[PDB]
From a paper:
PriX is required for primase activity and the protein is encoded by a gene that is essential for viability. We have shown that PriX has replaced the Fe–S cluster domain of PriL as the primase module responsible for endowing primase with the ability to initiate nucleic acid synthesis.
To determine a structural basis for the role of PriX in priming DNA synthesis during DNA replication, we determined the X-ray crystal structure of heterotrimeric PriSLX from S. solfataricus at 2.9 Å resolution. Although no RNA/DNA was detected in the density map, two AMPCPP molecules were clearly visible. The first AMPCPP was bound in the active site of PriS, in what is considered the elongation site of primase12. The side chains of the basic 72-RKR-74 motif in PriX contact the triphosphate, with R72 and R74 buttressed by supporting interactions provided by Y103 and D140, respectively. Alanine mutation of D70, R72, R74 abolish or severely impair the initiation step of primer synthesis, but leave unaffected the ability of primase to extend an existing primer, indicating that the NTP-binding site in PriX represents the initiation site of primase.
Numbering used by the authors:
A (entry chain F): 57 to 154
B (entry chain D), D (entry chain A): 11 to 329
C (entry chain E): 3 to 267, 298 to 305
E (entry chain B): 3 to 267, 293 to 306
F (entry chain C): 48 to 154
């Protein structure tokens, strides 16, 4: 899970929410197992790396609660590539360019 | 139904709907006239934008806004919409309560028909159910207890509305973690109000807190429609809109003892020449009216539009 | 509030400062032989259903707990983590039934339980035969959260709610703390699948041996042969290594055979009884 | 009050249908009770939105969603709908296969009658077709061959479903360019499965690939309904919905050897008092049953609802 | 891989870089006398059903190829453009039956044919009398694409599919390449109805003459007369000018008569002898 | 008589693609831009998808599916469809026409 922490630490642009919804939130809660409020503040900290845009705390809590209750697992880079190619290409280039 | 449209269109020209403050976060939806499919995923930022859409583009037979708040109310995918909390809803239907008079019939020959079609005229049968004011009374008792539970046990501040047809809607604006409650957590609240797993407290005091006093005040569980309360996302019928099955106003009930079920709930003035399907004597908006099959009759617009949308006949002209 | 009784209060970093600095638990676990063995004692006791000793019966109470978490994380058996967190919370129950109010409120405040004392509530049932008193109250939104995974006795309709707050007695405050702990333990095991672990410390906790001679004939030629490949991987499957990290040790080779060996899905010097 | 209706409405209150992930891109459709014409152009974004419609607005005798994905599933203009791909479907009907016992009769006098009406009673004649489990066996052999072709020749991962009545549905979820296949390209796949232009490989080996080994294993072409596979805009009967001709569940067959055709396919509990139309001995859900004309009989709900929707009689009450 | 045999490998722009820069094909076609004459020869050979010389019988094969496409584009006859791409692919077929495996797979890679070498497939038929081998495989979705316009010999039910891949021999790999080329040529002629053409280069490829005095009697008065208009337009239909670009040539005049003339659709016959030269 | 021509001036399509639109973005993709990018300019099949998606998200209010664009490209490729004339656009859809003309006036 090194890439999730690497993508979380640097940031993204286009698929930040699809990454928060299907990867970042599920990882911070159901693999790293952080505090419920620590994930929310981190996901806000992660989202505001491109800094242009806004995301609601109420939505992030909603995503955190939903993956917590359903034990959802972050998408594999294999699933990310087959199903959502726009999201994949944004992640792979942030990994190549560092 | 061409004339019914003009009535509704005229009401919405000047009516002021009660709209939430975060209007731009709600999905609006409506059933237009003559179409079994809803128009949804609409979003408006002002009561004036909504007024233009209803009057010029799509007149609503039923008008709603979502109990949920979304980042993108107009997105068609649910996860795109980005749910960020929803209000707590209750719906009290006087179905289970009163058990009313019902008539299935053919609008052409006017006969009682058990089947869904009529042999002669080859038309599907319509059903008319008589909505009495004792029915609305029993419904009003249920929401009275419901407001008691929500205020005294939960500490919430509910709003009561006449549903526009057969009962009342109770809505609690809550914006903190109350808005993020599970359908599972909402089913816990729903079953508390219904008294499902509430134990009888056999020899307690009427002044005891929660369900202890309430069970000893003779009150038991509230007959609500649980799926309305359980569903995290729901369509709220907009207050002051018209209910397409009656023509009545979804009206705020500020005092649960002053509510009378009569023509004042309808906003339609004048008279309409009304053509009944059957010879019937029924109670209509708390006033008994006698109609004769195929015999045109001059009655108030409120009573005529109501009887129209209840399948008893057709409004043929306006006076 | 006794840290010796409730180890999960203090963080792991705040404990590693007694021993200079930079030294993480992975380092200290190689020196001590008793710690890993004591963690083995608990796990074996939860596998057989016996009580767990309170953590005051240990010379280094904080360390025995984390190395029991770290051992459970390495074994990576969720159906066992369930039995343990159950048994471990059962053990912590008894310690709660001996604690005073201000300490009970302190533990709950450290577990993010928003439970407080308030104006008590008394009421009579069955014509004043039974009496019922409650001096702790939680907000109903928090109460529904804390009872997410609980039996019908905790169902909201069986409780006493007044002005938004559910009222509990001391025994109920305890039952919530005990369940809050059964959750913190599962949540404290997840962040132990983070860093890599010196694979001898792993095989010590796993009670393994070494890698035999027949295997190290391969870590040299970097090209091998045909039967030298069909068997090189069927060994690596028996350790329990993942599908990803297998191709990374033997670089510069065929991926067409990576497929035919996943379809399979010297050994005595490893599975020591 | 239709009694079958209450059964159906009760099942849909709690049933969990298998719905695709991109739910909002499908056109939903249903045949209501007492109306021979479908309601279509429906769209829903969540299983809860759909459940409300089925239970409160329009109860389905038959329920479908489109194999195709649309940008505007509810648009009536086909270019507004914006077709953007469809799943690959196969439908094996025991029409061509077995040819069953059928009886046309008058439900009033109980006599075998060839004509569409009965002279005496002036009532239309009903037809009952006996669905044996030997028929389902032959159908099940066909889909076994089809899954073989799709898995071994095409490399696909098909899903098998009991159609709810007389056969099986095979559906391949495909998300890439497989979904964009022409109706013409789908007819090529359809004819490959049917073995239409497949040459006989007269002296080959059973282990040969594709249709070479298959033809020498004795297997020939699969009897599918080609129009189901060719139509890019087909309606899929929803899995876990009720088939309005039997009351059975459209059920996933996860292992094509464990499938038994019996009452367990129906979700209806309790008992029903059933009034047969004729004296007949037939096989019903794998159990031979003797019915006597005009003689009420207490049987399980599953068997009663089934025999009702198959025109053998009427369910009169539920216990 | 011989460019002299397969001109469509190189783009037209990549060949015009041999001549400095900025110089497009329009320039080289006026300098060179041989190009236009050779391009007409192919078209005339396909008009009578005769074989087409391989592009190795040309000193500049790439240029002869595109000006054969550009000439066909100007005639704007689809029923002949079809005949050419047909005939031209037949010529390219024979050249493929002389090419090695390594070259055949590279051409297909340039025609966007996703065909590769795979684990071969052997099986016996009619009690081991017949043997059949296939060492090339394409995915069935691509195969259905590549055979969109092909006869029953390629129908999917007559093929050998395994785990999603159709298996072919070399003669089938060639027959697919031959069909991919018959498509690449038709696809290469559409983007030649793009640019305007210096209408002498147009009329050079068309082999035209001039426009007589009586027509240039009109491009001067800018008001003309009455019968000076009925014949000015009935002539313009015979050149082959479109309905749109005609009204733009004579501006500041009546458009009411533009309608009534669409319904029509020194020297003797002044313009038609000096334009349609039998050469 | 000889074979009559038709047109050859498609410069406005490139201008509308480069700037963007507002109301009729999809009717433009379906009847003009796709048929032009593939059957007149003859660009790559996948490059047209990347260009048509870039074009649609200029006003950004709304969404268009990658799967729909591939479907439209395949359909115009298989049938050789040619983009609409500015006159034919004018007779059939004045809402779309006026939206295009404003992008043409704005240069
Ligand atoms: N919450 C969500 N979950 C899943 N997909 C979402 C989503 N919000 C948006 N999308 C997807 O993103 C596209 C449109 O939304 P966008 O404007 O791109 C939001 P985004 O890419 O998720 O994050 P952004 O805020 O960094 O732009 C569509 O492809 C849509 O499917
Ligand atoms: N067609 C529809 N689709 C979705 N939700 C609807 C709906 N009609 C009503 N609702 C909502 O569903 C809830 C309960 O509605 P119902 O009991 O089915 C009818 P109503 O609007 O309450 O009037 P009535 O019960 O007096 O006839 C309310 O929140 C209402 O706004
Ligand atoms: N009225 C209808 N219109 C369109 N498609 C329908 C349909 N009824 C069913 N379908 C679908 O078309 C295929 C064949 O339908 P039918 O054979 O006519 C009914 P069915 O659902 O297959 O049950 P049955 O064949 O056992 O009676 C199936 O994939 C089914 O889902
Ligand atoms: N894919 C499509 N192809 C052609 N016409 C379409 C279409 N989708 C919608 N329309 C038509 O265009 C008008 C408005 O439809 P919309 O949903 O607004 C798509 P639009 O205006 O073309 O593009 P846009 O809203 O994405 O910018 C209606 O008259 C409708 O019939
Ligand atoms: Mn984005
Ligand atoms: Mn209601
Ligand atoms: Mn069928
Ligand atoms: Mn638009
Ligand atoms: Zn009648
Ligand atoms: Zn009879």
């Amino acid at each position: 899970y090194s890439w999730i922490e690497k993508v979380l630490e640097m940031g993204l642009q286009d698929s930040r929410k699809r990454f928060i919804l299907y990867v970042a939130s599920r990882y911070l809660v159901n693999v790293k197992g952080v505090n419920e409020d620590e994930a929310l503040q981190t996901l806000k900290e992660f989202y505001y790396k491109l800094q242009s845009g806004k995301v609601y705390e109420s939505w992030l809590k909603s995503v955190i609660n939903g993956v917590k209750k359903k034990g959802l697992l972050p998408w594999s880079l294999k699933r990310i590539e087959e199903r959502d190619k726009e999201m994949y290409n944004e992640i792979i280039r942030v990994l190549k360019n560092s | 139904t061409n004339l019914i449209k003009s009535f509704f269109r005229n009401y919405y020209l000047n009516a002021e709907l009660e709209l939430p403050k975060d209007m731009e976060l709600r999905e609006f939806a409506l059933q237009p006239f003559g179409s079994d499919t809803y128009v949804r995923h609409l979003s408006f930022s002002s009561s004036e934008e909504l007024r233009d859409y209803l009057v010029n583009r799509n007149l609503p037979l039923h008008l709603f806004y979502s109990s949920a708040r979304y980042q993108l109310p107009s997105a068609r995918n649910m996860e795109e919409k980005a749910w960020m909390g929803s209000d707590l809803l209750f719906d009290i239907d006087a179905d289970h309560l009163c058990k009313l008079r019902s008539i299935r019939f053919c609008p052409v020959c006017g006969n009682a028909v058990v089947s869904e079609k009529c042999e002669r005229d080859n038309v599907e049968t319509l059903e008319y159910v008589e909505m009495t004011s004792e029915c609305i009374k029993r419904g009003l008792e249920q929401t009275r207890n419901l407001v008691e539970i929500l205020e005294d046990d939960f500490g919430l501040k509910p709003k009561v509305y006449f549903s526009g047809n057969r009962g009342f809607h109770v809505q609690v604006d809550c914006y903190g973690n109350c808005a993020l409650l599970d359908s599972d957590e909402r089913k816990e609240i729903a079953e508390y109000v219904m008294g499902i797993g509430v134990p009888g407290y056999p020899g307690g005091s009427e002044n005891a807190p929660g369900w202890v006093g309430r069970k000893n005040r003779g009150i038991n569980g509230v007959t609500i429609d649980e799926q309305v309360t359980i569903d995290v996302k729901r369509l709220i019928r907009i207050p002051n809109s018209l209910h397409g099955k009656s023509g009545l106003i979804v009206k705020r009930v500020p005092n649960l003892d002053d509510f009378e079920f009569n023509e004042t709930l309808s906003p339609f003035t004048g008279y309409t020449i009304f053509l009944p399907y059957i010879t019937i004597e029924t109670e209509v908006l708390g006033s008994i009216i006698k109609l004769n099959r195929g015999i045109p009759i001059k009655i108030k617009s409120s009573i005529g539009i109501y009887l129209h949308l209840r399948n008893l006949g057709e409004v043929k002209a306006y006076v | 509030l006794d840290v010796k009784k409730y180890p999960f209060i203090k963080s792991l970093d705040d404990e590693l400062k007694k021993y200079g600095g930079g030294i993480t638990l992975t380092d200290l676990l190689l020196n001590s032989t008793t710690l890993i063995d004591q963690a083995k004692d608990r796990i074996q006791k939860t596998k057989s259903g016996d009580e767990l000793p309170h953590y005051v019966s240990y010379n280094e109470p904080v360390l025995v707990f984390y190395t029991t978490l770290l051992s459970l994380a390495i074994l990576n058996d969720v159906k066992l983590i369930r039995r343990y967190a159950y048994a471990e919370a059962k053990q912590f129950r008894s310690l709660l039934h001996t604690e005073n109010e201000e300490n009970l409120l302190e533990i709950s405040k450290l577990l993010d339980l928003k439970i407080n004392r308030c104006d008590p509530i008394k009421f009579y049932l069955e014509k004043k035969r039974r009496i019922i008193q409650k001096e702790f109250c939680v907000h109903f939104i928090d109460y529904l959260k804390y009872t997410k995974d609980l039996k019908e006795d905790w169902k909201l309709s069986g409780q006493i709610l007044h002005k938004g707050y559910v009222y509990l007695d001391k025994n109920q405050l305890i039952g919530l703390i005990a369940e809050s702990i059964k959750s913190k333990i599962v949540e404290m095991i997840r962040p132990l699948n983070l860093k890599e672990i010196p694979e001898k410390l792993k095989s010590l906790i796993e009670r393994r041996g070494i890698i035999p001679p027949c295997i190290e004939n391969i870590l040299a030629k970097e090209k091998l042969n045909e039967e030298e490949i069909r068997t090189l991987i069927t060994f690596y499957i028996d350790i329990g290594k993942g599908l990803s990290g297998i191709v990374s040790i033997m670089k510069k080779y065929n991926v067409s055979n990576v497929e035919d060996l996943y379809r399979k899905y010297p050994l005595q010097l490893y599975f020591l009884s």
